[PDB]
């Protein structure tokens, strides 16, 4: 009976991000490897660029093929793992044990929205 | 405090809007969709996340650029509102486009609807 309907979903963005997290965890449809202290992390260059000024600058311009990025020794796995989890889930867990390294890694990567 | 667990209510929305900006600018995209001859750029990860049809045509494919042509039953009139929904969480229907959008929803099996 209506001429126009404009709908919004409050959960769709959350569902997409959690789908992307599942892909990351399964290493399915990923397109960049991040090396942190030599350890391998798979991700999507689109998401990394969306969440970090540092990654954005190392990703825009690069070949469309497989991309490998090595982070320097300032970034530790202890500081990076909580932040890649935040990027893909919107949840950040800090402990007294990891807070100094996560802080360091946030500064280094300039993660948006802390 | 020994432990702090934070959640952001706006982060997923911010990420999706960043991905939409990349789509619109054709930056960091990795798949081209052809619909009624018209070209749309997107991210295979997002398309697979939002559509069972796309998921089936994406998983297993070569790592390089991927081109997917949708058959003549999918129209631009019906697809454009859905690709916008996939990337923005907003769906606009009109009397003019509702039949085609419905058809394309059936064809693609777009989730969260």
UniProtKB/Swiss-Prot annotation, chain A:
Subcellular location: Nucleus
Domain BTB: 30-96
Signal peptide: none
Post-translational modification: Ubiquitinated by the SCF(FBXL17) complex or by the by the SCF(FBXO22) complex, leading to its degradation by the proteasome. Under oxidative stress, reactive oxygen species covalently modify cysteine residues on the bZIP domain of BACH1 and release it from chromatin. If the BTB domain of BACH1 remains intact, its beta1-alpha6 degron is recognized by FBXO22, promoting its ubiquitination and degradation.
Disulfide bond sites: none
Quaternary structure note: Heterodimer of BACH1 and MAFK.
Family of the protein in this entry: Belongs to the bZIP family. CNC subfamily.
Function: Transcriptional regulator that acts as a repressor or activator, depending on the context. Binds to NF-E2 DNA binding sites. Plays important roles in coordinating transcription activation and repression by MAFK. Together with MAF, represses the transcription of genes under the control of the NFE2L2 oxidative stress pathway.
Protein's recorded name: Transcription regulator protein BACH1
Native organism taxonomy: Eukaryota, Metazoa, Chordata, Craniata, Vertebrata
């Amino acid at each position: 009976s209506m001429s126009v309907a404009a709908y919004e979903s409050s959960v769709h963005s959350t569902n997409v991000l959690l789908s992307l997290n599942d892909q990351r965890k399964k290493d399915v449809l990923c397109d960049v490897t991040i090396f942190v202290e030599g350890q391998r992390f798979r991700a999507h260059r689109s998401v990394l660029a969306a969440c970090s000024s540092y990654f954005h600058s190392r990703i825009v311009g690069q070949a469309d093929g497989e991309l490998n990025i090595t982070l320097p020794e300032e970034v530790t796995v202890k500081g990076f793992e909580p932040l890649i989890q935040f990027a893909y889930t919107a949840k950040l867990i800090l402990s007294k044990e990891n807070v100094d390294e996560v802080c360091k890694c946030v500064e280094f990567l300039s993660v948006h929205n802390i």
